Design an enzyme around this catalytic site. Structure first.
Site, PDB file in Angstrom:
ATOM      1  N   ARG A 112       0.723  -1.156  -0.070  1.00 49.03           N
ATOM      2  CA  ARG A 112      -0.003  -0.011   0.091  1.00 49.03           C
ATOM      3  C   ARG A 112       0.636   1.269   0.049  1.00 49.03           C
ATOM      4  O   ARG A 112       1.829   1.162   0.570  1.00 49.03           O
ATOM      5  CB  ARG A 112      -0.947   0.116   1.213  1.00 49.03           C
ATOM      6  CG  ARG A 112      -2.097  -0.838   1.053  1.00 49.03           C
ATOM      7  CD  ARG A 112      -2.944  -0.663   2.470  1.00 49.03           C
ATOM      8  NE  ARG A 112      -2.285  -1.007   3.826  1.00 49.03           N
ATOM      9  CZ  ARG A 112      -1.945   0.013   4.408  1.00 49.03           C
ATOM     10  NH1 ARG A 112      -1.919   1.155   4.365  1.00 49.03           N
ATOM     11  NH2 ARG A 112      -1.100  -0.771   5.563  1.00 49.03           N
ATOM     12  N   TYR A 121      -0.935  -4.696  -6.605  1.00 51.98           N
ATOM     13  CA  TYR A 121      -0.674  -5.436  -5.280  1.00 51.98           C
ATOM     14  C   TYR A 121      -1.903  -5.065  -4.282  1.00 51.98           C
ATOM     15  O   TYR A 121      -2.243  -3.924  -4.063  1.00 51.98           O
ATOM     16  CB  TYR A 121       0.567  -4.261  -4.463  1.00 51.98           C
ATOM     17  CG  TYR A 121       1.050  -5.503  -3.910  1.00 51.98           C
ATOM     18  CD1 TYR A 121       0.699  -5.385  -2.503  1.00 51.98           C
ATOM     19  CD2 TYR A 121       2.013  -6.571  -4.068  1.00 51.98           C
ATOM     20  CE1 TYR A 121       1.282  -6.431  -1.366  1.00 51.98           C
ATOM     21  CE2 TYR A 121       2.764  -7.186  -3.146  1.00 51.98           C
ATOM     22  CZ  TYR A 121       2.389  -7.281  -1.941  1.00 51.98           C
ATOM     23  OH  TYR A 121       2.987  -8.347  -0.916  1.00 51.98           O
ATOM     24  N   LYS A 168      -9.453  -3.516   1.599  1.00 55.95           N
ATOM     25  CA  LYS A 168      -9.394  -2.510   2.647  1.00 55.95           C
ATOM     26  C   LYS A 168     -10.153  -1.371   2.247  1.00 55.95           C
ATOM     27  O   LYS A 168     -10.989  -0.583   3.054  1.00 55.95           O
ATOM     28  CB  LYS A 168      -7.927  -1.874   2.757  1.00 55.95           C
ATOM     29  CG  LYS A 168      -7.036  -2.890   3.286  1.00 55.95           C
ATOM     30  CD  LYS A 168      -7.013  -3.312   4.770  1.00 55.95           C
ATOM     31  CE  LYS A 168      -5.747  -3.810   5.629  1.00 55.95           C
ATOM     32  NZ  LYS A 168      -5.075  -5.013   4.859  1.00 55.95           N
ATOM     33  N   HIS A 184     -11.099  -3.056  11.680  1.00 55.25           N
ATOM     34  CA  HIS A 184      -9.988  -3.604  11.500  1.00 55.25           C
ATOM     35  C   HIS A 184      -9.516  -4.691  12.836  1.00 55.25           C
ATOM     36  O   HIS A 184      -8.743  -4.624  13.561  1.00 55.25           O
ATOM     37  CB  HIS A 184      -8.596  -2.730  11.403  1.00 55.25           C
ATOM     38  CG  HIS A 184      -7.223  -3.614  10.917  1.00 55.25           C
ATOM     39  ND1 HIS A 184      -6.257  -3.010  11.017  1.00 55.25           N
ATOM     40  CD2 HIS A 184      -7.430  -4.590  10.082  1.00 55.25           C
ATOM     41  CE1 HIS A 184      -5.245  -3.910  10.713  1.00 55.25           C
ATOM     42  NE2 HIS A 184      -5.946  -4.793  10.050  1.00 55.25           N
ATOM     43  N   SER A 242      -1.109  -3.869  12.548  1.00 53.91           N
ATOM     44  CA  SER A 242      -0.805  -4.897  11.486  1.00 53.91           C
ATOM     45  C   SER A 242       0.556  -5.782  11.596  1.00 53.91           C
ATOM     46  O   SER A 242       1.551  -4.906  11.976  1.00 53.91           O
ATOM     47  CB  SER A 242      -1.041  -4.531  10.295  1.00 53.91           C
ATOM     48  OG  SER A 242      -2.113  -3.789  10.024  1.00 53.91           O
ATOM     49  N   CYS A 283       1.130  -7.406  14.107  1.00 56.01           N
ATOM     50  CA  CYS A 283       1.489  -7.608  15.740  1.00 56.01           C
ATOM     51  C   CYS A 283       0.742  -9.290  16.155  1.00 56.01           C
ATOM     52  O   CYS A 283       1.136  -9.326  17.375  1.00 56.01           O
ATOM     53  CB  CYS A 283       0.427  -6.769  16.494  1.00 56.01           C
ATOM     54  SG  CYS A 283       1.280  -5.588  17.373  1.00 56.01           S
ATOM     55  N   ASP A 316      -9.144 -10.466  10.321  1.00 53.56           N
ATOM     56  CA  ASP A 316      -8.348  -9.057   9.855  1.00 53.56           C
ATOM     57  C   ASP A 316      -9.888  -8.078   9.877  1.00 53.56           C
ATOM     58  O   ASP A 316      -9.420  -6.741  10.412  1.00 53.56           O
ATOM     59  CB  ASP A 316      -8.113  -9.128   8.330  1.00 53.56           C
ATOM     60  CG  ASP A 316      -7.226  -7.763   7.927  1.00 53.56           C
ATOM     61  OD1 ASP A 316      -6.594  -7.370   8.686  1.00 53.56           O
ATOM     62  OD2 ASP A 316      -7.363  -7.265   6.940  1.00 53.56           O
ATOM     63  N   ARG A 335       3.112 -12.124   0.938  1.00 52.37           N
ATOM     64  CA  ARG A 335       1.684 -12.607   1.103  1.00 52.37           C
ATOM     65  C   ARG A 335       1.470 -14.085   0.999  1.00 52.37           C
ATOM     66  O   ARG A 335       1.919 -14.586  -0.176  1.00 52.37           O
ATOM     67  CB  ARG A 335       0.633 -11.603   0.671  1.00 52.37           C
ATOM     68  CG  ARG A 335       0.971 -10.243   0.921  1.00 52.37           C
ATOM     69  CD  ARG A 335       0.385 -10.260   2.312  1.00 52.37           C
ATOM     70  NE  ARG A 335       0.440  -8.902   2.983  1.00 52.37           N
ATOM     71  CZ  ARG A 335      -0.174  -8.082   3.877  1.00 52.37           C
ATOM     72  NH1 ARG A 335      -1.284  -8.698   4.320  1.00 52.37           N
ATOM     73  NH2 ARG A 335       0.061  -7.046   4.283  1.00 52.37           N
TER      74      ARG A 335
END
Length: 620
Positions: free
Chosen positions: A85, A233, A242, A262, A284, A286, A309, A403
């Site tokens: 991002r 991406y 998102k 989130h 994110s 974590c 998520d 990913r």
């Protein structure tokens, strides 16, 4: 009904039928075909056959590789300029700036990024005309949420990228059944292009079409449009992930009396067979995926994953806060994933998985930092840059933001209710950060209003990226910092208003910190499956057990209320310690941050909670 051909693009349709689309879906397709000038139109049906053909064709064209070690897994490698991002190129368009973002007292907002309608129209006109020349426009009809859930919402994504089609098949519900459920209803218009019309003006890097210079990810919530250009991406291209399920959805939820967050959703069952659902907002990488797929170490405990998520939540008629997972798959960070840290994730991704920017073994397998599996002598590693790689190299074999994209149904602990249309009743909301100093293992909010302040004040150590070098501690309120669909201060007001809903069953709110370190730098808490010992305490607190002690920051576990058997010598003094000096500094930093970044949009309730916390610390 035309003097020539109309805007009838039937001659270019290579799958499906335009005559079969709902009228407004058809106008969306044909209007954007005229603009973007694709060679072909493919109306996706979502079938296994379509998917297999798509992958096989991508393989033939050199866009993905088949990983021969596994059952139906694939590897895409990207241009290094298109790996994440891009926050600074992600924008929201509204009539008024302040509806989108608080006006910061200094510098640039960290909470949102507005663009005027005027500037966006000019940006749009410089990018999209002719942008799909030579390419296929895929039409992806998709549901965010279980088809026919009352909480579900439908979008149509137009894309020139078959990678996006394949990834969207995993990550959303997509195909003909979505068009049948939509009928003549409202949908979110999602327009994407990699921004590389044929013939190419610059050469391709790693057979990956993108336009880094012109990348722009725009949201127009009032128009229910998401318009993304130049990146293939992840969160830039998979517009459900998102743009729709947080940014647009959080503005819709504000309008309509729900929440788009989130948050992972898990179900936890104790040894007595009592089950609760918890939601958790963690900044994110974590360990969202880690907590939601935990194998608990305490005998007789079980954790099942509803989502890792995104959570859409709404009060039902009995006052329960019901949550659904609006996604259909996991788009998880690969590096750090191992048989020890997350065996369930490893089992999930064994098959039918698309990998992006990981390393490939000469085996036809996958590799990344932290995989914790040794390779046989002679098995070599090709990095994500398509180069031979040895550990001696400074560089990682896998991109840090690499990913896996995998079907949720393959998670071995997927919750039986993970697709239930009415959603699951949330009894606890957990906020977290990674904090090496000051913040103890777990605490509980004193009130709903305190709980909202806890979320608003969240900070976490994040790995510095293309904005920072090394670890940096950053504010990430509600783990939503990059994702607010509107002014953060109004978002806090929306959360605070939940306390006023009659007969609402408000979840208990907690904060956790798995990453506190002691005086000479080592982790105080082992984490991973041992985190079940903290969930156990939360579970008991939701049942009203007398297991808590009042502190200035909230309730903590009483001495001996935690099961620490089997952990050896836990330094409880330092783990659960509360330093006046640390907390005076923390409240002063939160004050400066909220004044700078939120100022006149901060709810008085939040300022009161800051004042109250300041006073409870002063009296230590």
């Amino acid at each position: 009904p035309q003097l020539h051909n109309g805007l009838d693009f039937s001659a270019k349709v290579i799958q499906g039928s335009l005559d079969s689309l709902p009228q407004e879906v058809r106008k969306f397709v044909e209007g954007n075909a005229q603009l973007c000038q694709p060679e072909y139109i493919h109306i996706c049906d979502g079938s296994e056959e379509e998917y297999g053909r798509l992958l096989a064709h991508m393989q033939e064209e050199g866009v993905i590789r088949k990983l021969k070690k596994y059952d139906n897994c694939w590897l895409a490698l990207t241009d290094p300029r298109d790996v994440a991002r891009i926050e600074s190129k992600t924008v929201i368009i509204t009539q008024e700036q302040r509806d989108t973002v608080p006006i910061p007292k200094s510098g640039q907002s960290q909470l949102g990024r507005w663009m005027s309608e005027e500037d966006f129209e000019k940006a749009f006109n410089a990018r999209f005309p002719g942008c799909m020349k030579g390419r296929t426009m895929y039409v992806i009809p998709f549901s965010m949420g279980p088809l026919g859930s009352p909480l579900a919402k439908i979008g149509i994504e137009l894309t020139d990228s078959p990678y996006v089609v394949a990834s969207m098949r995993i990550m959303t519900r997509m195909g003909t059944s979505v068009l049948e459920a939509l009928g003549d209803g409202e949908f979110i218009k999602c327009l994407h292009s990699v921004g590389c019309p044929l013939p190419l003006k610059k050469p391709l890097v790693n057979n990956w079409a993108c336009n880094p210079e012109l990348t722009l990810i725009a949201h127009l919530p009032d128009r229910r449009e998401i318009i993304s250009f130049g990146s293939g991406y992840g969160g830039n291209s998979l517009l459900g992930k998102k743009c729709f399920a947080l940014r647009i959805a959080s503005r819709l939820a504000k309008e309509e009396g729900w929440l788009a967050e989130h948050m992972l959703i898990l179900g936890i069952t104790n040894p007595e067979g009592k089950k609760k659902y918890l939601a958790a907002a963690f900044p994110s990488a974590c360990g969202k995926t880690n907590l939601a797929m935990m194998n608990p170490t305490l005998p007789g405990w079980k954790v099942e994953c509803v989502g890792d998520d995104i959570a859409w939540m709404k009060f039902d008629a009995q006052g329960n806060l019901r949550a659904i997972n609006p996604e259909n798959g996991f788009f998880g960070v690969a590096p750090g994933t191992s048989v020890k840290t997350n065996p369930n994730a490893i089992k999930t991704i064994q098959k039918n998985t698309i990998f992006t920017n990981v390393a490939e073994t000469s085996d036809g397998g996958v590799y990344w930092e932290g995989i914790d599996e040794p390779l046989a002598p002679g098995v070599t590693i090709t990095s994500w840059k398509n180069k031979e790689w040895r550990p001696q190299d400074e560089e990682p074999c896998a991109h840090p933001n690499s990913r896996f994209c995998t079907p949720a149904s393959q998670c071995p602990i997927i919750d039986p209710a993970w697709e239930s249309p009415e959603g699951v009743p949330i009894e606890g909301i957990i906020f977290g950060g990674r904090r090496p100093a000051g913040v103890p293992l777990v605490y509980e909010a004193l009130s709903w209003q305190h709980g909202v302040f806890v979320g608003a004040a969240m900070r976490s150590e994040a790995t510095a990226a293309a904005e920072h070098k090394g670890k940096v501690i950053m504010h990430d309120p509600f783990a939503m910092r990059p994702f607010f669909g509107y002014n953060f201060g109004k978002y806090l007001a929306h959360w605070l208003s939940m306390a006023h809903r009659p007969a609402a069953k408000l979840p208990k709110i907690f904060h956790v910190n798995w990453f506190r370190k002691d005086k000479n730098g080592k982790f105080l808490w082992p984490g991973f499956g041992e985190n079940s010992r903290v969930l156990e305490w939360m579970f008991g607190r939701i049942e009203g057990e007398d297991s808590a002690k009042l502190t200035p920051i909230g309730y903590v576990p009483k001495e001996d209320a935690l099961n620490l058997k089997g952990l050896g010598d836990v330094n409880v003094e330092e783990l659960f310690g509360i330093s006046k000096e640390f907390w005076e500094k923390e409240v002063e930093e939160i004050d400066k941050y909220l004044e700078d970044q939120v100022n006149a949009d901060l709810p008085y309730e939040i300022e009161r909670e800051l004042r109250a916390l300041k006073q409870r610390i002063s009296q230590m």
